[PDB]
Design a protein around this ligand. Structure first.
Ligand SMILES: COc1ccc([C@@H]2C(C#N)=C(N)OC3=C2C(=O)C[C@@H](c2cccc4ccccc24)C3)cc1
Ligand SMILES: N[C@@H](CC(=O)O)C(=O)O
Ligand code: NA
Length: 399
């Protein structure tokens, strides 16, 4: 019994270091909290956590583009459509199951919007690809193009480009071979970036915990709702569909959930979720390159629940809330504080004052660290479900 735990410590070396990083980060952050805090000085303190974020952001661009180009090229017309339909149906249901779970819990325990739709439409079709790799569109930072990255515009273009090569046969093969080499090469860089994660995660959360009262019971509604949907609803869905153990599946992606908690960005933790599914859970690359990049921005289960709870909490009808909370879920990017920005849209539709968001902002960060964990988990189990379901398509692609 105790001799068997030594084989666990030798193997899970990096997984236990990121756990210890959280345990130490919560300690050090609370230890350095009574000291005279400063914006400039907190920025200096949280710098080892800042370098990890830069390393992971560096890899999101060559991952998104290479994954979707090879991923769609490697599949037939009806195959990618069937693969897509299995993913979309899953994405639509899980975000609807989350908002229904969110609305019921907030009802039981009660504690420029056109421009937004236009900007998103403008972002699905970028005017410049070199630009899209570091800028997004936000109508009104110079002009209407905000510094970021159009993750959605790249996902949409790379998809049609991957389809085009998968339609031009052997002429397309060269570029597919080129984009395949690049996908693996960056997946070798995420191996290097993985040994820095325990040091980074420690400082990312220690710095964040160095920063009327009714919000405590609002924070409870969200956190409880995330556990019911995350550790009870989603594992049940996987066990019902795949007929496989979900809590041993969650053990593989556990290294990525901790980094989602540390960074609070599902797009920035994508290179690690890719490594955790392809390696630890042994999910097919032909489907992880398909499910995960789209899952980063479109499937946001934890955000959808947070959009429903926070909208009804500031009321201190439901049909419009459930429709726009699922709408805000899809819209919002896998970036920190994204839910808070899309909350402006979910409050305008119902008729509540948008200035009421100011009450939430203070707590928001701590809920976002868990919101991302459920947003990531929904894609990991999503890929696990789609891989298992698309069994016949994958068997046809082999010889
Ligand atoms: C809100 O935006 C999205 C965009 C895509 C998707 C689906 C997805 C996932 N996950 C991925 N990786 O690829 C495809 C999907 C389709 O359903 C459509 C699918 C598809 C089928 C057949 C031909 C295509 C040609 C070009 C692009 C997609 C094509 C590809 C879902 C939501
Ligand atoms: N932080 C979340 C997005 C949000 O703010 O809801 C994510 O990246 O999954
Ligand atoms: Na989203």
């Amino acid at each position: 019994t105790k001799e068997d735990v030594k084989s666990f410590l030798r193997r899970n070396a990096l997984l236990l270091l990121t756990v210890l990083a959280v345990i130490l980060g919560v300690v050090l952050g609370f230890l350095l909290r009574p000291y005279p805090l400063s914006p400039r000085e907190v920025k200096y303190f949280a710098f080892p956590g800042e370098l990890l974020m830069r390393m992971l952001k560096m890899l999101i661009l060559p991952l998104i583009v290479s994954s979707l180009i090879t991923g769609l090229a490697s599949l037939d017309a009806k195959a990618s459509g069937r693969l897509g339909m299995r993913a979309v149906v899953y994405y639509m249901s899980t975000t609807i199951i989350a908002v229904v779970l969110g609305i019921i819990l907030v009802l039981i325990i009660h504690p420029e919007v056109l421009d937004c739709f236009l900007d998103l439409a403008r972002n699905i079709f970028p005017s410049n690809l070199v630009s899209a790799a570091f800028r997004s569109y936000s109508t009104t930072p110079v002009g209407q193009e905000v510094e970021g990255m159009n993750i959605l515009g790249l996902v949409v273009f790379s998809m049609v480009f991957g389809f085009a090569l998968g339609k031009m046969g052997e002429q397309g093969q060269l570029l597919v071979d080129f984009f395949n080499s690049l996908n693996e090469a960056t997946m070798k860089l995420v191996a290097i970036i993985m040994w820095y994660a325990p040091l980074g995660i420690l400082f990312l959360i220690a710095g964040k915990i160095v920063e009327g009262g009714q919000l405590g019971m609002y924070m409870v509604t969200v956190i409880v709702g995330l556990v019911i949907h995350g550790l009870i609803v989603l594992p049940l869905i996987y066990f019902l569909i795949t007929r496989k153990n979900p809590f041993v599946f969650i053990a593989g992606i556990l290294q990525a959930l901790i980094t989602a908690l540390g960074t609070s960005s599902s797009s920035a933790t994508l290179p690690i979720t890719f490594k955790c599914l392809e390696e630890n859970n042994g999910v097919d690359k032909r489907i992880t390159r398909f499910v995960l990049p789209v899952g980063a921005t479109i499937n946001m289960d934890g955000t959808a629940l947070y959009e429903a709870v926070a909208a009804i909490f500031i009321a201190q009808q439901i049909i419009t809330i459930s429709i726009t909370a699922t709408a805000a879920s899809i819209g919002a990017a896998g970036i920190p504080q994204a839910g808070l920005v899309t909350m402006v849209i979910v409050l305008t539709a119902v008729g509540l004052p948008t200035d009421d968001i100011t009450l939430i902002i203070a707590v928001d960060w701590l809920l976002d660290r868990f919101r991302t964990m459920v947003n990531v988990l929904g894609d990991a189990l999503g890929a696990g479900i789609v891989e298992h379901l698309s069994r016949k398509e994958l068997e046809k692609q082999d010889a």
